[PDB]
Design an enzyme around this catalytic site. Structure first.
Site, PDB file in Angstrom:
ATOM      1  N   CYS A 132       0.832  -1.180   0.000  1.00  0.00           N
ATOM      2  CA  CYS A 132       0.000   0.000   0.000  1.00  0.00           C
ATOM      3  C   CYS A 132       0.878   1.245   0.000  1.00  0.00           C
ATOM      4  CB  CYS A 132      -0.913  -0.011   1.218  1.00  0.00           C
ATOM      5  SG  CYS A 132      -0.042  -0.489   2.731  1.00  0.00           S
ATOM      6  N   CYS A 135      -0.433  -5.473   7.804  1.00  0.00           N
ATOM      7  CA  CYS A 135      -0.730  -4.146   8.340  1.00  0.00           C
ATOM      8  C   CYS A 135      -0.582  -4.137   9.867  1.00  0.00           C
ATOM      9  CB  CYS A 135      -2.140  -3.736   7.941  1.00  0.00           C
ATOM     10  SG  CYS A 135      -2.348  -3.604   6.144  1.00  0.00           S
TER      11      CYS A 135
HETATM   12  S1  FES Z   1      -3.375  -0.334   3.602  1.00  0.00           S
HETATM   13 FE1  FES Z   1      -1.456   0.709   4.062  1.00  0.00          FE
HETATM   14  S2  FES Z   1      -1.536  -0.093   6.113  1.00  0.00           S
HETATM   15 FE2  FES Z   1      -3.102  -1.560   5.430  1.00  0.00          FE
END
Ligand code: FES
Ligand code: FES
Lengths: 128, 128
Positions: free
Chosen positions: B33, B102
Protein backbone atom coordinates in the site's frame (compact mmCIF):
# COMPACT_ATOMS: atom_id res chain seq x y z
CA UNK A 1 12.67 -28.21 22.15
CA UNK A 2 13.00 -27.49 18.42
CA UNK A 3 11.71 -28.98 15.14
CA UNK A 4 13.43 -31.21 12.55
CA UNK A 5 12.89 -28.60 9.86
CA UNK A 6 14.35 -25.81 12.02
CA UNK A 7 17.33 -28.02 12.83
CA UNK A 8 17.92 -28.60 9.10
CA UNK A 9 17.81 -24.87 8.20
CA UNK A 10 20.02 -23.91 11.17
CA UNK A 11 22.66 -26.54 10.28
CA UNK A 12 22.57 -25.91 6.52
CA UNK A 13 21.14 -22.37 6.05
CA UNK A 14 20.41 -21.40 2.46
CA UNK A 15 21.26 -18.02 0.90
CA UNK A 16 23.82 -16.90 3.45
CA UNK A 17 26.04 -14.08 2.17
CA UNK A 18 25.96 -10.53 0.79
CA UNK A 19 25.15 -8.93 -2.51
CA UNK A 20 27.49 -6.06 -3.43
CA UNK A 21 25.52 -3.11 -4.76
CA UNK A 22 22.07 -4.73 -4.13
CA UNK A 23 18.82 -3.49 -5.64
CA UNK A 24 17.18 -3.59 -2.20
CA UNK A 25 18.73 -3.67 1.26
CA UNK A 26 16.79 -4.18 4.51
CA UNK A 27 18.25 -4.32 8.06
CA UNK A 28 16.40 -4.92 11.33
CA UNK A 29 17.90 -5.34 14.83
CA UNK A 30 16.56 -7.46 17.72
CA UNK A 31 17.31 -5.12 20.66
CA UNK A 32 17.21 -7.86 23.32
CA UNK A 33 20.29 -9.68 22.01
CA UNK A 34 21.55 -6.82 19.79
CA UNK A 35 21.67 -9.17 16.80
CA UNK A 36 21.10 -7.59 13.36
CA UNK A 37 19.47 -9.23 10.33
CA UNK A 38 20.34 -7.94 6.87
CA UNK A 39 18.60 -8.99 3.65
CA UNK A 40 19.99 -8.15 0.19
CA UNK A 41 17.92 -8.56 -3.00
CA UNK A 42 18.69 -8.33 -6.73
CA UNK A 43 15.59 -7.65 -8.86
CA UNK A 44 15.19 -8.60 -12.49
CA UNK A 45 11.89 -8.67 -14.44
CA UNK A 46 10.18 -7.61 -11.20
CA UNK A 47 11.27 -10.92 -9.64
CA UNK A 48 13.79 -11.82 -6.91
CA UNK A 49 16.74 -12.77 -9.08
CA UNK A 50 19.06 -13.14 -6.06
CA UNK A 51 18.70 -12.99 -2.30
CA UNK A 52 21.20 -13.22 0.58
CA UNK A 53 21.02 -12.73 4.30
CA UNK A 54 23.69 -11.89 6.87
CA UNK A 55 23.30 -12.08 10.64
CA UNK A 56 25.24 -13.07 13.74
CA UNK A 57 21.96 -13.94 15.51
CA UNK A 58 20.59 -17.13 17.06
CA UNK A 59 19.61 -20.51 15.64
CA UNK A 60 15.94 -19.54 15.41
CA UNK A 61 16.68 -16.31 13.53
CA UNK A 62 19.11 -18.02 11.14
CA UNK A 63 16.80 -20.98 10.38
CA UNK A 64 13.82 -18.63 9.81
CA UNK A 65 15.84 -16.48 7.43
CA UNK A 66 17.04 -19.56 5.52
CA UNK A 67 13.37 -20.65 5.07
CA UNK A 68 12.07 -17.17 4.19
CA UNK A 69 14.78 -16.40 1.64
CA UNK A 70 14.27 -19.81 0.04
CA UNK A 71 10.54 -19.09 -0.32
CA UNK A 72 11.23 -15.67 -1.83
CA UNK A 73 13.78 -16.75 -4.48
CA UNK A 74 12.47 -16.19 -8.01
CA UNK A 75 9.04 -14.91 -6.91
CA UNK A 76 7.52 -11.62 -8.02
CA UNK A 77 8.06 -8.65 -5.68
CA UNK A 78 4.36 -8.67 -4.86
CA UNK A 79 4.30 -12.38 -3.95
CA UNK A 80 7.46 -11.95 -1.85
CA UNK A 81 5.82 -9.10 0.05
CA UNK A 82 2.97 -11.37 1.10
CA UNK A 83 5.37 -13.81 2.83
CA UNK A 84 5.27 -13.56 6.68
CA UNK A 85 6.53 -15.85 9.52
CA UNK A 86 3.02 -17.21 9.40
CA UNK A 87 3.95 -19.00 6.18
CA UNK A 88 6.38 -21.18 8.13
CA UNK A 89 4.38 -21.34 11.40
CA UNK A 90 4.19 -25.12 11.20
CA UNK A 91 7.98 -25.55 11.17
CA UNK A 92 8.26 -23.10 14.10
CA UNK A 93 5.54 -24.74 16.29
CA UNK A 94 6.59 -25.21 19.92
CA UNK A 95 9.61 -22.90 19.79
CA UNK A 96 10.26 -21.05 23.09
CA UNK A 97 7.93 -18.01 22.94
CA UNK A 98 10.86 -15.57 23.10
CA UNK A 99 12.02 -16.98 19.74
CA UNK A 100 8.90 -15.38 18.21
CA UNK A 101 10.89 -12.13 18.14
CA UNK A 102 13.88 -13.83 16.54
CA UNK A 103 11.63 -15.43 13.92
CA UNK A 104 10.13 -12.07 12.90
CA UNK A 105 13.50 -10.60 11.87
CA UNK A 106 13.64 -12.46 8.57
CA UNK A 107 10.31 -11.37 7.10
CA UNK A 108 10.69 -7.83 8.47
CA UNK A 109 14.13 -7.44 6.83
CA UNK A 110 12.84 -8.88 3.57
CA UNK A 111 9.94 -6.40 3.59
CA UNK A 112 12.39 -3.59 4.32
CA UNK A 113 14.62 -4.61 1.39
CA UNK A 114 11.64 -4.66 -0.99
CA UNK A 115 10.47 -1.22 0.22
CA UNK A 116 14.02 0.04 -0.26
CA UNK A 117 14.02 -1.13 -3.87
CA UNK A 118 10.52 0.22 -4.56
CA UNK A 119 11.24 3.66 -3.14
CA UNK A 120 14.35 3.93 -5.33
CA UNK A 121 12.13 3.14 -8.30
CA UNK A 122 9.63 5.79 -7.21
CA UNK A 123 12.38 8.42 -6.90
CA UNK A 124 13.66 7.59 -10.39
CA UNK A 125 10.18 8.29 -11.77
CA UNK A 126 9.90 11.64 -9.94
CA UNK A 127 9.35 13.67 -13.16
CA UNK A 128 10.01 11.01 -15.84
CA UNK B 1 -16.10 -7.92 9.28
CA UNK B 2 -13.91 -6.44 12.05
CA UNK B 3 -13.74 -6.80 15.85
CA UNK B 4 -15.45 -4.42 18.30
CA UNK B 5 -12.13 -3.72 19.99
CA UNK B 6 -10.54 -2.97 16.59
CA UNK B 7 -13.43 -0.67 15.76
CA UNK B 8 -12.91 1.21 19.04
CA UNK B 9 -9.15 1.73 18.49
CA UNK B 10 -9.65 2.75 14.84
CA UNK B 11 -12.36 5.32 15.74
CA UNK B 12 -10.57 6.67 18.83
CA UNK B 13 -6.84 5.81 18.37
CA UNK B 14 -4.65 6.54 21.36
CA UNK B 15 -1.19 8.16 21.18
CA UNK B 16 -1.51 9.68 17.73
CA UNK B 17 1.04 12.42 17.08
CA UNK B 18 4.77 13.15 17.00
CA UNK B 19 7.48 13.76 19.53
CA UNK B 20 9.93 16.50 18.51
CA UNK B 21 13.49 15.41 19.15
CA UNK B 22 12.52 11.87 20.34
CA UNK B 23 14.82 9.52 22.24
CA UNK B 24 13.97 6.72 19.80
CA UNK B 25 12.47 6.85 16.32
CA UNK B 26 11.37 3.80 14.30
CA UNK B 27 9.81 3.79 10.80
CA UNK B 28 8.59 0.82 8.77
CA UNK B 29 6.79 0.88 5.38
CA UNK B 30 4.22 -1.63 4.08
CA UNK B 31 5.30 -1.79 0.42
CA UNK B 32 1.97 -3.15 -0.86
CA UNK B 33 0.00 0.00 0.00
CA UNK B 34 3.07 2.25 0.46
CA UNK B 35 1.80 3.28 3.90
CA UNK B 36 4.48 4.17 6.49
CA UNK B 37 4.28 3.69 10.26
CA UNK B 38 6.40 5.90 12.51
CA UNK B 39 6.83 5.41 16.26
CA UNK B 40 8.42 8.05 18.52
CA UNK B 41 9.48 7.30 22.12
CA UNK B 42 10.72 9.41 25.04
CA UNK B 43 12.67 7.38 27.62
CA UNK B 44 13.00 8.30 31.27
CA UNK B 45 14.22 5.99 34.07
CA UNK B 46 14.56 3.29 31.39
CA UNK B 47 10.79 3.41 30.90
CA UNK B 48 8.57 4.64 28.04
CA UNK B 49 7.76 8.10 29.35
CA UNK B 50 5.99 9.11 26.13
CA UNK B 51 5.00 7.39 22.91
CA UNK B 52 3.35 8.61 19.69
CA UNK B 53 2.65 7.11 16.31
CA UNK B 54 2.06 8.68 12.91
CA UNK B 55 0.74 6.88 9.84
CA UNK B 56 -1.57 7.43 6.89
CA UNK B 57 -2.23 3.67 6.70
CA UNK B 58 -5.39 1.58 6.97
CA UNK B 59 -7.86 0.96 9.78
CA UNK B 60 -6.14 -2.27 10.80
CA UNK B 61 -2.70 -0.64 11.00
CA UNK B 62 -4.03 2.38 12.93
CA UNK B 63 -6.04 0.29 15.44
CA UNK B 64 -3.07 -2.06 16.03
CA UNK B 65 -0.73 0.85 16.64
CA UNK B 66 -3.22 2.44 19.07
CA UNK B 67 -3.33 -0.88 21.04
CA UNK B 68 0.44 -1.48 20.92
CA UNK B 69 1.41 2.04 22.00
CA UNK B 70 -1.13 1.89 24.83
CA UNK B 71 0.42 -1.38 26.06
CA UNK B 72 3.92 0.09 25.88
CA UNK B 73 3.24 3.35 27.79
CA UNK B 74 5.18 3.48 31.06
CA UNK B 75 6.71 -0.01 30.71
CA UNK B 76 10.42 -0.71 30.97
CA UNK B 77 12.33 -0.85 27.65
CA UNK B 78 12.81 -4.58 28.12
CA UNK B 79 9.11 -5.27 28.72
CA UNK B 80 8.17 -3.08 25.72
CA UNK B 81 10.55 -5.07 23.52
CA UNK B 82 8.69 -8.28 24.35
CA UNK B 83 5.38 -6.88 23.00
CA UNK B 84 4.39 -8.39 19.59
CA UNK B 85 1.09 -8.47 17.58
CA UNK B 86 0.62 -11.78 19.32
CA UNK B 87 -0.20 -9.88 22.49
CA UNK B 88 -3.35 -8.53 20.85
CA UNK B 89 -4.13 -11.59 18.67
CA UNK B 90 -7.52 -11.99 20.31
CA UNK B 91 -8.69 -8.50 19.29
CA UNK B 92 -7.40 -9.11 15.74
CA UNK B 93 -9.10 -12.56 15.29
CA UNK B 94 -10.95 -12.90 11.98
CA UNK B 95 -9.33 -9.91 10.27
CA UNK B 96 -8.82 -10.41 6.50
CA UNK B 97 -5.51 -12.31 6.23
CA UNK B 98 -3.86 -9.50 4.25
CA UNK B 99 -4.31 -7.27 7.32
CA UNK B 100 -1.73 -9.48 9.08
CA UNK B 101 0.92 -7.40 7.30
CA UNK B 102 -0.73 -4.15 8.34
CA UNK B 103 -0.95 -5.35 11.95
CA UNK B 104 2.79 -6.12 12.08
CA UNK B 105 3.81 -2.51 11.34
CA UNK B 106 3.10 -1.29 14.86
CA UNK B 107 5.27 -3.74 16.79
CA UNK B 108 8.03 -3.61 14.16
CA UNK B 109 8.20 0.21 14.35
CA UNK B 110 8.17 0.12 18.14
CA UNK B 111 11.07 -2.38 18.12
CA UNK B 112 12.91 -0.14 15.65
CA UNK B 113 12.44 2.93 17.87
CA UNK B 114 13.79 1.05 20.91
CA UNK B 115 16.83 -0.19 18.93
CA UNK B 116 17.38 3.38 17.74
CA UNK B 117 17.44 4.64 21.33
CA UNK B 118 19.67 1.80 22.54
CA UNK B 119 22.24 2.27 19.78
CA UNK B 120 22.47 5.99 20.55
CA UNK B 121 23.20 5.01 24.14
CA UNK B 122 25.84 2.58 22.85
CA UNK B 123 27.79 5.64 21.55
CA UNK B 124 28.96 6.39 25.11
CA UNK B 125 30.95 3.12 25.22
CA UNK B 126 33.16 4.42 22.39
CA UNK B 127 34.40 6.93 25.03
CA UNK B 128 37.83 5.62 26.15
S1 FES C 1 -3.38 -0.33 3.60
FE1 FES C 1 -1.46 0.71 4.06
S2 FES C 1 -1.54 -0.09 6.11
FE2 FES C 1 -3.10 -1.56 5.43
S1 FES D 1 19.02 -13.64 20.35
FE1 FES D 1 19.88 -12.56 18.60
S2 FES D 1 18.36 -13.47 17.29
FE2 FES D 1 17.71 -14.77 18.98
Amino acid sequence: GYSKKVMEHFMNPRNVGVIDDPDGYGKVGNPVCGDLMEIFIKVGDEKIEDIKFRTFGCGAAIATSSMITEMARGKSLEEAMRITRNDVADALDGLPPQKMHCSNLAADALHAAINDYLSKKQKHLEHH
